[model samples]
Target: HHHHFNLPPGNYKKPKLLYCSNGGHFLRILPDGTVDGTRDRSDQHIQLQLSAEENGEVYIKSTETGQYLAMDTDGLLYGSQTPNEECLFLERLEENHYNTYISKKHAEKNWFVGLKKNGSCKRGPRTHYGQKAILFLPLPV
Candidate 1:
């Protein structure tokens, strides 16, 4: 079969393992799209497929519920199958090697995907860049 309609020769977009820089816990996406870093790294809830989309946008899909990581105008992260600007994130690689995901809907706000001290998810400001904004190191292996 031609590769045009068939699966690629190899895996093009690989899964990304994201953890909390604060506690080093795996980041999990719930069925409702709640994000947290309180689960094991290998748990299905935490395993995310970084779907690279057109126009330099990426979709973070949950391996557990097959939902997409969604953000709202209020800066809340949740899971849903609906595709909108809220579900698209722009990955910004920091000088420290940690990455911060920003919501496309509110780019000027500088709100990023961040975790709270209790392992809950929240959208923090750019000035709040710290353990909350920094995700675990990317292990390409």
Candidate 2:
């Protein structure tokens, strides 16, 4: 039996997380949002860049039990689900990275995207200035 999944940011892909905006806006931007297709079919340029970095070269696991993804429930994907999606490997992302956002020159597609200023921890009445990329928890699909 196929499990029915929900939509909207908070449900899947972690609600707090948003698109990188600069890189290829992979993951078909739906009218209501949420990538609507499979990895290859979905435009994951932005998500992959922020998460993986090597041009969204993320490997999807086509496991029958449904593997956990870093951006999903687990901080890492399973060893089995390495072929569910096509992706490229990238540098290790700093943990959490919210308190001390790292600013660096982002280069992809043979072009310079620009220097990201980085984000900071939360302050009075305001959240970490730009704590967009946070590690999402694992979920049971």
Candidate 3:
């Protein structure tokens, strides 16, 4: 028999910083609604609230900008005013204890949330599971 595990319901308690395993950058949403990986953890825009769905899906929202992290069809990351399907992601805890967030809209295509070594967004199509650039650790804010 295949085992099944029930996921927890959506919960938003405290803000968090998504620290990327690659280049030691943190996921941030700029005031202009641009998404970037920054080395400055002190940036207020880096604080994000993660609201998780019962099915293990999550919405990453910027506390400062009131925008949701979104990925376009071209695999570019940006900030959207509303939380739509493009803003949803499946958050997974990898074997290394780091987390990986794959776009819900592109999960079938294996599109992942990733960043480059220079703290820039990495196109989702260029990312793969277990890649250093795609792994992130959620740190308490």
Highest-lDDT candidate: 3
TM-score of 2: 0.20
Q: What local lDDT does model 2 show for residue 77?
A: 18
Q: Please tell me which model should have the higher lDDT, number 1 or number 2.
A: 1
Against the unseen true structure, what C-alpha lDDT does each candidate score? 0.65, 0.23, 0.84
TM-score of each: 0.77, 0.20, 0.90
Clashes of each: 3, 18, 0
Query: Least accurate stretch of 10 residues (summed lDDT) in model 3?
Result: 1-10
Lowest lDDT 10-residue stretch of candidate 1: 1-10
| Model 2 misplaced regions, further than 4 Å | 1-58, 65-86, 95-134, 137-141
* Off by more than 4 A, model 3: 1-11
Ranking by TM-score: 3, 1, 2
Tell me the lDDT of candidate 1. Answer: 0.65
Scored against the true structure, residue 115 in model 2 reaches a CA lDDT of 15
Q: How would you encode candidate 1's per-residue C-alpha lDDT over 1-141 as one tens digit per residue?
A: 110111112222777677666666666787666677775555668778877775445788876688888777777788887777888876655544566666777766766777765677765453244545455554332
Model 1, total clashes: 3
